[PDB]
C-alpha cells in the first residue's frame, strides 16, 4: 500500500511529559508524586513525516506512553491500541473523523498500514463484537494542507489503570522550521486530564494513524514516542493551581538534594540525601524444582468422606499446589483463607501442609472458621484462633446424597467438655437425657430432594506452616 | 487484571487434546440455589472535585448565611459559617481547599455561586477571673 | 504530684478501644478480637 | 445454648459486641429477645 | 430508627393509585432456600 521508507531519530526528552497526577485543586505547594512518569533527559524516538517518509511502526505500550506530535495541518488523526492488532483479539480505535473524536473498542480486521486517504477512512475492512462506540468531544479538524513551518506541539500521555485508558492532553505553540534540528521544546507544560475511557482491555502495543493526500503521499509532520517509567517527581503548584515547575528526583545529585528537601531552591551547604537514584528493574524468582502436582483428585474426588466427628487428616508434601486444576471439575462454594491471602497462594511455598476432610450439613459450613459456636465447632471439629490456612467447601449431592437417603455420615451431639483445637474424639459412648440414655452420635439424613441448607457439603481444611 | 474483559475465542491444551476455554452454564429450573442463575450488578463510584451526575433522593433546604450551621453540598458535609464569596474558581469543579485540607469555599449547586466556609469561633477568647472564693464577675478578652 | 496524678487518671481512657478495662475486653471477646483492643490500650498507655 | 443443639439447627449465629465462644462464661444484667419471620435472602439484613 | 416498631395500617401513593404498605409473604414448601421462611431471634445484652 505505502511502499515509502521510514526515518526514525533519537532525541532527548528534556523536561517534557509532566501531567497532573490527581484531581485536587492545590496551590502554592511542592508535592512529591510517585508513579509512572517520563524521565527527564531520556531517550525518546523521533519519527518524521516530512520529505515524504512514512514512519509508522507498532511501538510497545509498556507501563504507559508519552506521545507528542509536531505538525501544522492536523496530520496525526489518532491511535490504535491492543495486543496483536489482528481480528483474533479486541482493539481500541481512537481517532478524529474531522468533526468528532470517536473511540471504538471493537474487533477489527485492520488493513495493512491503516491510514486515512484524505477525509475518507481506510482503517478496517470489518468490525464485530464491538463493545464501545461513542464520541468523546466535538472538535473540528480539517484535512487541508497548511504550508510553512511547524506551528504547534500536541502532547499526550496514555495510561492504563483499572481497565481504563486515561488520556492527558496539552497543546503549546512551538515554531519549528522544516529543515531545522529535531528537538523538543524547553520548560514545563503540564498535561491536564482529558478523558477516562473504560476500554476494559489489555494493551501491550499501539500504532499511530496519520492521513495522506489523495495521491497517498505523506504530509509534513513529526511524532515522538516515549515510555513512562517508575519514578518519583516533585511538582511546583502555582497560586492559581497550575503546575509551573518539576524535578525528576532520580536525574542528578542536585535533583536528589532538591527531592530530599521540599524546595526548588537550595541554599549553600552540605545535605544528606535519601536514595532516589537506583530502583530495581528485574525480578529474580527462584523456586524449588519440584514438578509433581498435589493429589487433589485423591482427596477432593474420593468415593467416601469421613464423618465430622472422625475427620481424616492427610499430609501433603513434595508437590505443586495448583488450585486452577480443580476449576473444570469442582465448583467451590467456600474458599476462605486465614493468615494468608488466597490471591497470594500461587506465589508461596509451604514447609508443612495438612488436609482435613469431612462432611457436614449445608448450614454448618459457617461453623468451620475460627471463633465459631455450634454443634460442629464445640463437639466435632474446632479450628484454632490463630489458624493459618484455607477452608474449602463445595456442595456434593451427586456423591453423598441419594433419592432414598444417605445415612453413612455421623456427627457428635454432646460431649462433657468442648473440644480443643484440632482435637478428634471417636469414642462411642452414651449420655443422659433426663432419665434415659441416648447415643452421643447422631445420623445425617442426606436426601437428594432437599434444600441447600440440608444438602451434604464436603469440607477440606488446609493448614499451612511458614518456617 | 481488575476491570479487564477478554471476549476472544480460543482453545487450550488439556493433556494432548484441545478444548474450548468457554464453558456453558446449564440453568435448570429444578435445582438448588447454589446452581440457580444469579444476576449481578456491580456499581462503581467516584468522589472527585467534579459536578455531580448521579446523586441521592435528599431534599434541599434554603441557604442560611452568617450563622454557624451544618451544611451538605453535593454530599460534602461539614459545619461552619456561610458567607458570600468573591473567590473566582475554576469551572467543572466544586469546592476550595487549603494547605491543611480544610474546605474554605464551596460552589452552590442551585445558585451557582461560591460561598466561604468560616469555622465557628475561630478567634481566641480569654477569660479574666479574680477567682472563685473572691468574686463571680469575669472579664473577656477577644483576641485580635 | 500533678504529673503522677495525670498518669494515674490516663488509665481510664479507651484510646479507641471498646473499654478502658482490660478485664472486660478479655472476658467479653475471644483471643483474636480482644488482641486488637488490647493492642490499642497498650499503644495508648505506652504513649502516656 | 447447647440444649438447642439436638432440636434446632442454626443457620446463623452471629454475635456483636461479645464473642459467641464467651457466652458460656458471661452473666447479663438484661436480656431481650426479638422474634420475627423474614425470607431466606433477607437474613443478611438483620445486622448493624 | 433502631429498635423502632411501626404496626399502623396505612396506604401510600404509587403513581396515581393507592396501595397498601404491607405486602404478603408467600411461603410455599417447594421453593428455594432464598424464598424459604426463616425464623430470626435477636438477643440484646447489657453488662452494667
Ligand atoms: C480430657 O480427658 C479428661 C479425662 O478423661 C477429661 O476430664 C473429665 O472432664 C469431665 C468434664 O468436665 C469431668 O466430669 C465432670 O466432673 C465433675 C464431677 O465428676 C462435675 O463438674 C461434672 O458433673 C456435671 O456434669 C455431668 C455431665 O457432664 C452431670 O451428670 C452432673 O450432674 C454435673 O452437672 C462432670 O461429671 C470428668 O471428671 C473429668 N475426668 C477426669 C478423669 O478428670 C477432660 O474433659 C478432657 N478434655 C477435653 C476433651 O478437652
Ligand atoms: C485525536 C485526538 C484529539 C484530542 C485529544 C483532542 C482534544 C482537543 N482538541 C481541541 C482543539 C483542537 N485541536 C485540534 C486538532 C487536534 N487535536 C489533537 O490533539 C489532534 C490529534 C488533532 C487533530 C486531529 C483542532 C484543530 C482544534 C480546534 C477545534 C475546535 O475549534 O473546537 C481541544 C480544545 C477544545 C476547546 O478549546 O474548546 C481539545 C481538548 N482533539 C483531537 O482531535
Ligand atoms: C434434647 O435435649 C434436651 C436437653 O437435654 C432434652 O430436654 C430434656 O428432656 C428430658 C427427657 O424428656 C426432660 O426430662 C428434661 O426436662 C428436658 N430438659 C429441657 C431443658 O427441656 C430433649 O428431650 C432432647 N430431645 C431429644 C433427645 O429429642
Ligand atoms: C480438567 O483439567 C485437568 C487438568 O488439566 C485435566 O486433567 C488432565 O487430563 C488429561 C486428559 O484429558 C491427562 O492427560 C492429564 O494428565 C490430566 N492432568 C492432570 C494434572 O490431572 C482433566 O482431564 C480436565 N477435565 C475435563 C476437561 O473434563
Ligand atoms: C413499584 O414501585 C415503583 C416505584 O414507585 C412503581 O413504578 C411507578 O408506577 C406508576 C404506576 O403504578 C407509574 O406512574 C410511575 O411512573 C412508576 N414510577 C417509576 C419510578 O417507575 C411500580 O409500579 C411499583 N410496582 C408495583 C406496585 O407492582
Ligand atoms: C538514547 O539517546 C542517547 C543520547 O545520548 C544515546 O546515546 C542512546 O544510544 C540512545 N538509545 C538508543 C536505544 O538509541
Ligand atoms: C481474520 O484474519 C485472518 C488473517 O489473520 C483472515 O484470513 C480472516 O479472513 C479474518 N477473518 C474475519 C475478518 O472474519
Ligand atoms: C490500501 O489502502 C487503501 C487506502 O489507503 C485501503 O482502502 C485498502 O484497504 C488498503 N489495502 C488493503 C489490502 O487493505
Ligand atoms: C464474536 O463473534 C462471533 C462471530 O461473529 C460470534 O459467534 C460470537 O458469539 C461473538 N462473541 C461475542 C462475545 O460477541
Ligand atoms: C460506530 O458508530 C457509528 C455511528 O453510529 C457507526 O457509523 C459505525 O459504523 C460504528 N462502528 C463500528 C460498529 O465499528
Ligand atoms: C492567575 O490568574 C489571573 C486571572 O486570569 C491572572 O491575572 C494572573 O496573572 C494569574 N497568576 C499567575 C501567577 O499566573
Ligand atoms: C472423581 O475422581 C475419580 C478418581 O479416581 C474418578 O474415578 C471419578 O470418575 C471422578 N468423578 C466422579 C463423579 O466420581
Ligand atoms: C436549578 O438549576 C439551575 C442550573 O442547572 C439553576 O439556574 C436554577 O437556579 C436552579 N433552581 C431552580 C429552582 O430552577
Contact B32 A23 (CB under 8 A): no
CA dist., res. C4 & res. A61, Å (int):
64
Q: Which of B117, B101, B123 is nearest to B49 (CA)?
A: B101
Q: Which of A310, A314, A284 is nearest to A302 (CA)?
A: A314
> D26 contacts in C (CB within 8 Å)?
27-28
Give me the residue label for grid cell 515522538. A224
> E30 contacts in B (CB within 8 Å)?
none
Cα-to-centroid distance, A187 and ligand 11 (Å): 18
Q: In the A/D pair of chains, how many CB contacts fall below 8 A?
A: 35
Q: Strands, E, within A202-318: which ranges?
A: 205-212, 221-227, 229-237, 243-248, 312-316
C-alpha dihedral sign at A397, A402, A408, A414: positive
What is the side-by-side order of every strand in the sheet holding A221-227?
A: A8-12, A43-48, A221-227, A65-71, A150-161, A164-176, A192-197
Q: What is the 3-state secondary structure (H, E, C) of chain B?
A: CCCCCCCCCCEEEECCEEEECCCCCCCCCCCCCCCCCCCCCCCCCCCCCCCCCCCCCCCCCCCCCCCEEEEEECCEEEEEEEEECCCCCCCCCCEECCCCCCCCEEECCCCCCEEEEECCCCCCEEEECCCCCCCCCCEEEECC
Report the nearest-CA residue for atom 10 of ligand 2.
A139
The kind and range of the H/E element at A117 are strand A101-117
Q: What residues have CB less than 8 Å from E33, skipping those under 6 apart? A: A451, A452, A453, B32, B33, D40
| DSSP reduced 3-state for A459 | strand
Asked if residue A131 has its Cβ within 6 Å of ligand 6, the reply is no
CA dist., res. B70 & res. B65, Å (int):
11
How close C26 gets to chain A, by Cα (Å)?
14
Give me the residue label for grid cell 464473642. D19
b/e A295-316 (16+ beta carbons within 10 angstroms → b): ebeebbeeeebbbbbbbeeeeb
The kind and range of the H/E element at A254 are helix A253-260
A333 interfacial to chain E (CB closer than 8 Å): no
| DSSP reduced 3-state for D2 | helix
Q: Strands, E, within A162-262: which ranges?
A: 164-176, 192-197, 205-212, 221-227, 229-237, 243-248
Cα-to-centroid distance, A171 and ligand 2 (Å): 9
Query: Cβ-count burial of B15 within 10 angstroms (0-12 exposed, 13-18 middle, 19+ buried)?
Result: exposed
State the pairing for strand pair A205-212/A101-117.
parallel
Helix, strand, coil tally for chain E in percent (to 5): 0, 35, 65
Nearest-10 Cα torsion for B105, B108, B109, B112: -110
Contact in structure between B33 and E34 (CB atoms under 8 Å): yes
Q: What residues have CB less than 8 Å from D30, skipping those under 6 apart? A: E44, E45, E46, E48
Which mutation among A240, A244, A245 tests ligand 11's pocket best, with the greatest number of atoms within 8 A of CB? A240
| CA-atom Rg of chain D in angstroms | 13
In this complex, which of A363, A371, A442 lies closest to D11 when CB atoms are compared? Answer: A363
Q: Which of A391, A332, A329, A337 is nearest to A366 (CA)?
A: A391
Torsional class of A84: left (φ above 0), alpha (ψ -120 to 50), beta (otherwise): alpha
Contact B2 A90 (CB under 8 A): no
Report the nearest-CA residue for atom 1 of ligand 7.
A87
Name the maximum alpha-carbon separation found in chain C: 38
Tell me the three cell numbers of residue A445.
439424613
| CA-atom Rg of chain C in angstroms | 12
Q: Which of A209, A74, A109, A103 is nearest to A165 (CA)?
A: A103
Give the ligand 7 atom nearest the CA of A125: 13
> E36 contacts in A (CB within 8 Å)?
451
Contact in structure between A103 and A132 (CB atoms under 8 Å): yes
Closest residue in chain E to residue A452, using alpha carbons only: E33
Q: Which of A415, A405, A418, A414 is nearest to A444 (CA)?
A: A405
C-alpha dihedral sign at B47, B53, B54, B60: positive
User: At CB < 8 Å, which residues of chain B contact E?
Assistant: 32-33, 36
Q: Which of A12, A64, A20 is nearest to A186 (CA)?
A: A12
Taking the mean position of all CA atoms in its chain, how far away is CA A353?
30
Q: Angle at CA A298, nearest 5°, toward A293 and A302?
A: 155
| DSSP reduced 3-state for A114 | strand
CA dist., res. A111 & res. A125, Å (int):
6
Q: Which of A6, A101, A108, A94 is nearest to A48 (CA)?
A: A6
Strand-pair partners of A105 = A92
Give me the residue label for grid cell 469543579. B93
Measured in angstroms, the resolution is 2.3
Q: What residues have CB less than 8 Å from A314, skipping those under 6 apart? A: A299, A354, A355, A356, A357
Q: What residues have CB less than 8 Å from A147, skipping those under 6 apart? A: none
| CA-atom Rg of chain B in angstroms | 30
CA dist., res. A221 & res. A51, Å (int):
10
Tell me the three cell numbers of residue A321.
499446589
**What are the angstrom distances between the C-alpha of C1 and each of A317, C5, C6, C8, C9?**
64, 6, 9, 11, 12
Tell me the three cell numbers of residue A97.
473523523
Tell me the three cell numbers of residue D12.
446463623
Give the ligand 11 atom nearest the CA of A242: 14
Using CB atoms, which chains have 3+ pairs under 8 A with A? B, C, D, E
Contact A414 D5 (CB under 8 A): yes
Query: Cβ-count burial of A180 within 10 angstroms (0-12 exposed, 13-18 middle, 19+ buried)?
Result: exposed
Tell me the three cell numbers of residue A166.
486515561
| DSSP reduced 3-state for A425 | coil
In A273-369, which residue ranges form alpha helices assigned H by DSSP? 296-300
**What are the angstrom distances between the C-alpha of A422 and each of A327, A382, A461, B31, B48?**
29, 6, 11, 35, 50
Q: What is the DSSP letter of A376?
A: I
How close D1 gets to chain E, by Cα (Å)?
12
Name the maximum alpha-carbon separation found in chain B: 100
How far from each other are the two terminal CA atoms of chain D, in whole angstroms?
Answer: 23
Nearest-10 Cα torsion for B82, B87, B89, B92: 30
Cα-to-centroid distance, A132 and ligand 10 (Å): 9
Which mutation among B7, B9, B21, B24 tests ligand 9's pocket best, with the greatest number of atoms within 8 A of CB? B9
Q: Which of A164, A19, A195, A20 is nearest to A102 (CA)?
A: A195
Using CB atoms, which chains have 3+ pairs under 8 A with B? A, E
Contact in structure between B111 and B119 (CB atoms under 8 Å): no
Contact in structure between A6 and A57 (CB atoms under 8 Å): yes
Asked if residue A1 has its Cβ within 6 Å of ligand 8, the reply is yes
Tell me the three cell numbers of residue B42.
456491580
* Ligand with smallest separation from the Cα of A440: 3
| CA-atom Rg of chain A in angstroms | 33
Cα-to-centroid distance, A325 and ligand 12 (Å): 14
| DSSP reduced 3-state for A366 | helix
The kind and range of the H/E element at A338 are strand A334-338
Torsional class of B53: left (φ above 0), alpha (ψ -120 to 50), beta (otherwise): alpha
Test mutation, D34, D42, D44, chain E, max E CBs within 10 A: D34
From the CB of residue E1, how many other CB atoms can be counted at a distance below 10 Å? 3
Amino acid at each position: 500500500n505505502i511502499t515509502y521508507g521510514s526515518h526514525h531519530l533519537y532525541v532527548s526528552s528534556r523536561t517534557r511529559g509532566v501531567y497532573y497526577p490527581d484531581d485536587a485543586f492545590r496551590s502554592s505547594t511542592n508535592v512529591l508524586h510517585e508513579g509512572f512518569f517520563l524521565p527527564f533527559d531520556s531517550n525518546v524516538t523521533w519519527y518524521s513525516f516530512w520529505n515524504q517518509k512514512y514512519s509508522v511502526a507498532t511501538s510497545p505500550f509498556g507501563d504507559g506512553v508519552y506521545f507528542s506530535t509536531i505538525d501544522k495541518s492536523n496530520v496525526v488523526r489518532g491511535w490504535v491500541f491492543g495486543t496483536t492488532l489482528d481480528n483474533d483479539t479486541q482493539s481500541v480505535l481512537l481517532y478524529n473523523d474531522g468533526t468528532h473524536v470517536r473511540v471504538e473498542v471493537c474487533t477489527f480486521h485492520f488493513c495493512p498500514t491503516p491510514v486515512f486517504s484524505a477525509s475518507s477512512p481506510h482503517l478496517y475492512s470489518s468490525a464485530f463484537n464491538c463493545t464501545l462506540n461513542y464520541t468523546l468531544a466535538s472538535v473540528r479538524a480539517d484535512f487541508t494542507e497548511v504550508d510553512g513551518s511547524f506551528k504547534t506541539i500536541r502532547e499526550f500521555v496514555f495510561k492504563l489503570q483499572d481497565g481504563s485508558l486515561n488520556v492527558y492532553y496539552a497543546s503549546t505553540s512551538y515554531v519549528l522550521a522544516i529543515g531545522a534540528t529535531s528537538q523538543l521544546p524547553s520548560g514545563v507544560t503540564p498535561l491536564v486530564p482529558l478523558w477516562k475511557i473504560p476500554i476494559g482491555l489489555n494493551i501491550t502495543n499501539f500504532k499511530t494513524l496519520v492521513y495522506l493526500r489523495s495521491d497517498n503521499t505523506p504530509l509534513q509532520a513529526a511524532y515522538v514516542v516515549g515510555h513512562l517509567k517508575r519514578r518519583t517527581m516533585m511538582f511546583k503548584y502555582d497560586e492559581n493551581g497550575t503546575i509551573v515547575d518539576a524535578i525528576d528526583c532520580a536525574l542528578d545529585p542536585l535533583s536528589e538534594t532538591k527531592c530530599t528537601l521540599r524546595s526548588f531552591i537550595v541554599e549553600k551547604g552540605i545535605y544528606q540525601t535519601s536514595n532516589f537514584r537506583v530502583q530495581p528493574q528485574d525480578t529474580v524468582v527462584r523456586f524449588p524444582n519440584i514438578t509433581n502436582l498435589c493429589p487433589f483428585s485423591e482427596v477432593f474426588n474420593a468415593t467416601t468422606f469421613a464423618s465430622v466427628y472422625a475427620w481424616n487428616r492427610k499430609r501433603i508434601s513434595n508437590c505443586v499446589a495448583d488450585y486452577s486444576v480443580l476449576y473444570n471439575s469442582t465448583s467451590f462454594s467456600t474458599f476462605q483463607c486465614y493468615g494468608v491471602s488466597s490471591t497470594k497462594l500461587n506465589d508461596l511455598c509451604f514447609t508443612n501442609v495438612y488436609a482435613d476432610s469431612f462432611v457436614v450439613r449445608g448450614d454448618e459450613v459457617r461453623q468451620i472458621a475460627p471463633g465459631q459456636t455450634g454443634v460442629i465447632a464445640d463437639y466435632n471439629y474446632k479450628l484454632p484462633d490463630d489458624f493459618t490456612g484455607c477452608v474449602l467447601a463445595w456442595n456434593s449431592r451427586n456423591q453423598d446424597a441419594s433419592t432414598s437417603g444417605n445415612f453413612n455420615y455421623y456427627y457428635r451431639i454432646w460431649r462433657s467438655e468442648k473440644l480443643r483445637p484440632f482435637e478428634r474424639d471417636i469414642a462411642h459412648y452414651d449420655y443422659q437425657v433426663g432419665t434415659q440414655f441416648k447415643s452421643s452420635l447422631k445420623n445425617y439424613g442426606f436426601y437428594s430432594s432437599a434444600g441447600d441448607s440440608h444438602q451434604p457439603y464436603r469440607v477440606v481444611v488446609l493448614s499451612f506452616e511458614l518456617l | 487484571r481488575p476491570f479487564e474483559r477478554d471476549i476472544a475465542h480460543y482453545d487450550y491444551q488439556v493433556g494432548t487434546q484441545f478444548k474450548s476455554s468457554l464453558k456453558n452454564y446449564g440453568f435448570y429450573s429444578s435445582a438448588g440455589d447454589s446452581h440457580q442463575p444469579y444476576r449481578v450488578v456491580v456499581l462503581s463510584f467516584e468522589l472527585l472535585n467534579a459536578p455531580a451526575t448521579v446523586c441521592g433522593p435528599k431534599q434541599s433546604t434554603e441557604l442560611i448565611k452568617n450563622k454557624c450551621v451544618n451544611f451538605n453540598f453535593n454530599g460534602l458535609t461539614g459545619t461552619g459559617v456561610l458567607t458570600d464569596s468573591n473567590k473566582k474558581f475554576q469551572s467543572f469543579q466544586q469546592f476550595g481547599r487549603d494547605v491543611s485540607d480544610f474546605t474554605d469555599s464551596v460552589k452552590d449547586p442551585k445558585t451557582l455561586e461560591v460561598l466561604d466556609i468560616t469555622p465557628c469561633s475561630y478567634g481566641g477568647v480569654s477569660v479574666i477571673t479574680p477567682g472563685t472564693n473572691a468574686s463571680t464577675q469575669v472579664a473577656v478578652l477577644y483576641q485580635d | 504530684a500533678q504529673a503522677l496524678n495525670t498518669l494515674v487518671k490516663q488509665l481510664s481512657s479507651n484510646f479507641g478501644a471498646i473499654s478502658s478495662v482490660l478485664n472486660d475486653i478479655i472476658s467479653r471477646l475471644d483471643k483474636v478480637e480482644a488482641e486488637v483492643q488490647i493492642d490499642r490500650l497498650i499503644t495508648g498507655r505506652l504513649q502516656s
